[PDB]
Amino acid sequence: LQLRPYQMEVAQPALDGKNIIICLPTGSGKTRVAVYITKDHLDKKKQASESGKVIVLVNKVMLAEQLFRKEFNPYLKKWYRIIGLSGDTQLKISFPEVVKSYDVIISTAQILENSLLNLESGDDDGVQLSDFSLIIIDECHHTNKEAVYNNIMRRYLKQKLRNNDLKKQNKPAIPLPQILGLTASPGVGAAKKQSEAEKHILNICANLDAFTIKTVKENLGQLKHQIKKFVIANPFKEKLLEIMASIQTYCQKSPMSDFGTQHYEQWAIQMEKKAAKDGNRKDRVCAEHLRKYNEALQINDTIRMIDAYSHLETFYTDEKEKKFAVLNDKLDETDEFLMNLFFDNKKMLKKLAENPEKLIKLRNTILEQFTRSSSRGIIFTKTRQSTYALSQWIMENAKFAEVGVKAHHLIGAGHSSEVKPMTQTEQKEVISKFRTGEINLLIATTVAEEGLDIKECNIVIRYGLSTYVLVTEREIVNDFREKMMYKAINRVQNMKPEEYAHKILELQVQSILEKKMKVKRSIAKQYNDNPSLITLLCKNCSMLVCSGENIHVVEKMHHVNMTPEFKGLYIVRENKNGEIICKCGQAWGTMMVHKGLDLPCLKIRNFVVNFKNNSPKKQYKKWVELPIRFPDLDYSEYCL
Amino acid sequence: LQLRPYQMEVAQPALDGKNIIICLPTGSGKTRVAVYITKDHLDKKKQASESGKVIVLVNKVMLAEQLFRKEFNPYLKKWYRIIGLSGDTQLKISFPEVVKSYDVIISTAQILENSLLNLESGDDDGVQLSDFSLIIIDECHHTNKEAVYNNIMRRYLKQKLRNNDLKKQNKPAIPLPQILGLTASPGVGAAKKQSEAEKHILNICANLDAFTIKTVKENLGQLKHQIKKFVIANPFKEKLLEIMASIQTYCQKSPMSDFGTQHYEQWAIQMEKKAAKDGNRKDRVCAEHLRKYNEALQINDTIRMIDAYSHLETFYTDEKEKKFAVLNDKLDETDEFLMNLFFDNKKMLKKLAENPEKLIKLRNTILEQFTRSSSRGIIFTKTRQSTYALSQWIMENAKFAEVGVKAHHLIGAGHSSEVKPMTQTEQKEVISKFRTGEINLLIATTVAEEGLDIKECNIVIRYGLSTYVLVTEREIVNDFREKMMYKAINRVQNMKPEEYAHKILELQVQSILEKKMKVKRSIAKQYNDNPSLITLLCKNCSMLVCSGENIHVVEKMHHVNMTPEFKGLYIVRENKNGEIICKCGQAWGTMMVHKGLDLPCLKIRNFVVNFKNNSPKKQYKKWVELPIRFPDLDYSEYCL
RNA sequence: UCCAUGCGCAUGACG
RNA sequence: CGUCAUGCGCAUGGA
RNA sequence: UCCAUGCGCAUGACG
RNA sequence: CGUCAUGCGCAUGGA
Ligand SMILES: [Zn+2]
Ligand SMILES: [Zn+2]
């Protein structure tokens, strides 16, 4: 396994047992450097005939799969055992056994963290860093806070301090493994001065217990040989603002801010909370409606107003369906007022919609851009909805199709934001098409920025964040941060070893003590653990919905209300298991058909709590917030 | 009937009316334990002078025959009545009468299940678990899902819950029988942790309504006295891959995966389905051809390429015969292209075939192995075709004959996979020869693994799955699973009785409610039951083949088309009742000469459906999938 | 004893 | 939920 | 392969 | 400390 010279120089310190960091520009193939380090370390242990283990940690499963497929296994098919562990891949043997075998391991951090926790717990599945003899970490820049990498390494730091104390006062010391570190760039965060950036670098080193940073400052020639611009370009709004002012007058609400900013939205949420604490109308409901209107304004500021019309149409059609279902099996004055205030203008609002806008300007830019050019293209943005809007809008246009510009959307897989997520398989398929060429342009929020193997891209356009385009100053600050980070690395590399040791030791002690106080506060957090001390009410209509003892739990994850008395209250809806709404139209939850039972599961976000101590109402957004515990459902009862 | 001490201890709880499980290592003769339990129970009932019945259930007919021949009858020839019931043995008296007589019964589960269903139905042949006073089950580990054992025992669980309700609210309770359970090992399935294995064990106990598990933890000495290693060792491929790439280019097909994996085959099947939904060529036909090529690649990866040549030769010779028959009484461009692309290389492909391979390596291993050694040998594999290939190939070699190694193939009897099945009689004969010694080595897929009485085997080789050999990590996971299962049993045995009762009760309720939802969904499945609403077309050539009313049914099992108009379409073929093919060469079905009528029976796999509602085309693979029903043939019509 | 057909079930691998 | 392989069981019919 | 749920983490903007 | 957006990871369950 031949190694490049610039790679060779940086790798040399690690071959001597030094736990260091190794940061190289993207495209330099530092993965092969890690493979060489691994092979050399395992050969050294073979010569010494000792436990040779490596645990490669990557924050994304895609990276573990790629490393198994391309770099580690092919180069080590013959000598050693390898396994591409991950959480999504179903294995048949537990993790401790994988440690007892499979000399070389590619995994994901939180799996190892879970195994360590189980060791600390009573699950009896044990594993310790002492078992491993070397640890390799990818994207070390994420080891800056209580993330998984730092959570793993803090245990190692604590054990190292205990080992120092034992050494000084005792003969035996628990062995600890070597620690390698890889990263495209150490990064700088919340830095305004060289001093702050240097403090950040020292913090990263202390978290990784590194000895020194390593870069290539002598063989830059072939590196530059292998590794190789900012361009910048209504009546519907005021009509909607008029409606907003009218509803404010109807509600006697003082915004204190303008329309189309996070300040107004935050105030709306705060007033919604207050209204829920008062059990009053025209405040909570109007708070939600103003939230929706402000969202419409914000999207219109960057997206065609047709999409704001679609958003409002979906919202009010859902409201109509809710009220119609309520009528089955009357309407409040507030609901009547708001719905009539909307519907009376919906048709004319749409009429305004078609009238011609950052969108048209961006179109004018990109159509001109595509005349130059194989062709490739990328677009960045913020919201998931914006991606769908741009995709369908560019599909509607005929000029792009005439040029042959085929575009497709791309987003993450998180189940949030009330948008259809994209699965990992679909992301893989889309990227494969992009490589093949079935799609000429990509629209991504942040996925294509890192992780996804997107390359040979001529155009990269950022819309509201190798030609580079930024449609809408941030590039200047980004370049300044890059330069400051490089200078900080240069300084830190050139430092007295003892001063560096003292500083990193102080930082390690600080981190450990902070974690100790975090543990103390977390333990002190939950203290009540009461069976039934509350009552749940509908936040819109301050009516009794549930008691504290009639609730039960399934899977220790879902909370349900089995009592027949409760079932006479809610209503069911479904369109395209089923959704559960109030008598007032407020959503309550979902009908889960689990274990041969039709459990009406409910969510806490949409209810309000009333303690038996008459304490003020509260909103939680999550069950775990309160410390009181509920009993687990017993199927013997209700079996019937 | 003397009983061994370790057997005595485990059997003791059952003598007190406890429904338990009894798992002992193979070779400990737990059958005699069951016989002792049966004799004691029947003697106890004789003393009480009540209905003494036992229904022994075994999942294989061979086991029932062996129990009748060796263990139950010989030990109970004198006192009680016994009968070796099975589905293959022709009896003269129905099953309910056998219950009314024949105190002790050895049978197979699905026979009892059929009788219970008839009781539930209107056939008037009745039988109930209340009739029996004891139930004995062999290989209880199969009672984990909706298999026959669990399907029988769920009725018992439901009846037990009804009995508890009656007891609490009423005086009388329907009697229920004792339940014994035998198994070599409870087994662990889909378990990665002690918790999951324990959950599996509890599920098995709930399905069997066991009181406790029982093992021998005190008399292990004589058990170990009576009851008593992993070894591990081209241009044709690329030539065929070149042809595959060429045909892909001819078809504009994007595989998205590599060659020689189930992914490519699954994609080929999906694209075949899509093509059938489009009624287009070069997609379905090429899908089948690529299926065959991928199968050839997979078998070549583990088998000599000569067998891949044989497979392709059979396929293309059958195609030539089909096209020649079509010419009797033209060829498509796609068929011409593919057949010419194959034949032009067949001779040179064979020339490559003889050029020297897991096969030669395995030969080198086994020839060396046979120098040690009465001699015995076993080989395991996956495919039925691999067994025939290995048998004929080892026959071709002269070294094995020189050593005196005689080998024979062995497979199951299922009528699937397009391979010649092996009959039960032939399996018995082969095993008898193996015991006698006419054959020194056996080649089996999975039959010899369990059920078949194969023993005193020095060598057991697994090729792509008391010396043990594994030619090609799974042994490690198997040992881990064994250890985890043993620990789970140890834990479950040592548990509070009331907690165990509560957990098993919850599991029983869960299983019953799940079955209730299954029944609901099955009832809701079929709703249409229409006489004629579809048309059948040939999937290759999207041409009308049959209407919905011209079809008729015989035996409520076969669907035929009596209309003369249909007969003018198809063609007949036969080589070595007859087979029916299309005008395009597509296979349609078989000519069944039944009840003095030459019915042209057809299969649904090879046709495509077109609803009268213009719904999209569909593929079913089975008639029962659609709910619409067809009329039964009336012989008065067509009698002529 | 052999042959043909239909239905159901479980295991393993893969997606 | 789908694909492949393997094994098993039951129910019909014929020689 | 798809769907639902829960939990945790980081980044950016804002207050 | 709170709000919004984005992305990621893990753990359950079902088809
Ligand atoms: Zn309400
Ligand atoms: Zn045809």
Numbering used by the authors:
A (entry chain A), B (entry chain A): 307 to 534, 539 to 543, 549 to 644, 668 to 694, 699 to 715, 718 to 809, 828 to 834, 842 to 945, ...
Publication text:
MDA5 recognizes double-stranded RNA (dsRNA) from viruses and retroelements. Cooperative filament formation and ATP-dependent proofreading confer MDA5 with the necessary sensitivity and specificity for dsRNA. Filament formation induces the tandem N-terminal caspase recruitment domains (CARDs) of MDA5 to oligomerize. MDA5 CARD oligomers recruit MAVS (mitochondrial antiviral signaling protein) via CARD-CARD interactions, nucleating the assembly of MAVS CARD microfibrils, which function as supramolecular organizing centers for downstream effectors of the interferon-β (IFN-β) and nuclear factor κB (NF-κB) inflammatory responses.
Four cryo-EM datasets were collected: I923V MDA5 filaments with ATP, transition-state analog ADP-AlF4, or no nucleotide bound and A946T filaments without nucleotide. In the absence of nucleotide, the I923V and A946T variants both had similar twist distributions to WT MDA5, with intermediate to high twists (81°–96°). In the structures of the I923V variant, there are minor differences in the side-chain positions of several nearby residues that occur, including E924, K925, H974, and Y1015, possibly to compensate for the smaller size of the valine side chain in the hydrophobic core. As a result, a hydrogen bond between the side chain of E924 and a ribose hydroxyl group in the RNA present in the nucleotide-free structure of WT MDA5 is lost in the I923V nucleotide-free structure. The loss of this protein-RNA contact partly explains the reduced RNA binding affinity and protein-RNA interaction area of the I923V variant reported above. In stark contrast, the I923V variant had 3.3-fold higher ATPase activity than WT MDA5, although filament formation was unaffected. We conclude that the isoleucine side chain at position 923 regulates the conformational changes necessary for ATP hydrolysis by shaping the CTD fold to tune ATPase activity to an optimal evolved level in WT MDA5. The increased ATPase activity of the I923V variant will result in overzealous proofreading, promoting premature dissociation from dsRNA.
